[PDB]
Amino acid sequence: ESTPIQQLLEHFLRQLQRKDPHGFFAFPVTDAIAPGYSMIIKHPMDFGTMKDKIVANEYKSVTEFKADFKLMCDNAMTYNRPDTVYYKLAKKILHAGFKMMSKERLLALKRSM
Numbered sequence: 457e458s459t460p461i462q463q464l465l466e467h468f469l470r471q472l473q474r475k476d477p478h479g480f481f482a483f484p485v486t487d488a489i490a491p492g493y494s495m496i497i498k499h500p501m502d503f504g505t506m507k508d509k510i511v512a513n514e515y516k517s518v519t520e521f522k523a524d525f526k527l528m529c530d531n532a533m534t535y536n537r538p539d540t541v542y543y544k545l546a547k548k549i550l551h552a553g554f555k556m557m558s559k560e561r562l563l564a565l566k567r568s569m
């Protein structure tokens with residue numbers, strides 16, 4: 457049993473995860489691999505958490521999903537230095553997400569529904 461919003465959100469999530477083939481954004485960051493992480497990042501987010509929220513139907517809208525996506529990227533851009541693979545990849549993901557879930561993109565989608 458799934459719903460149209462769940463299917464749409466699963467599509468966006470799958471498209472974004474394709475940009476992170478190594479799964480750096482797939483699971484929560486621990487302090488053991490990222491020293492100090494929990495002291496600097498107060499609201500952690502990752503793709504796996506987002507997938508669980510989709511499954512539990514916790515997102516009422518694409519706006520709420522976008523907010524978690526944005527948090528995940530902002531966290532990575534705040535914690536990691538600009539030279540790192542994690543920072544760079546966060547910028548890539550974020551740009552892809554802005555393109556995919558922009559207001560004009562969502563308008564065109566609404567037109568077709």
Ligand SMILES: CC(=O)c1cc(-c2cc(C(=O)NC3CC3)ccc2C)c2ncccn12
Nearest residue numbers: 479480481483484485489490532535536542
């Ligand atoms: C998003 C973020 O800030 C982040 C993600 C990771 C991460 C890395 C690996 C890994 O396999 N790394 C080896 C290739 C070098 C696995 C799982 C995670 C969560 C990470 N590690 C250190 C500092 C920041 N991060």
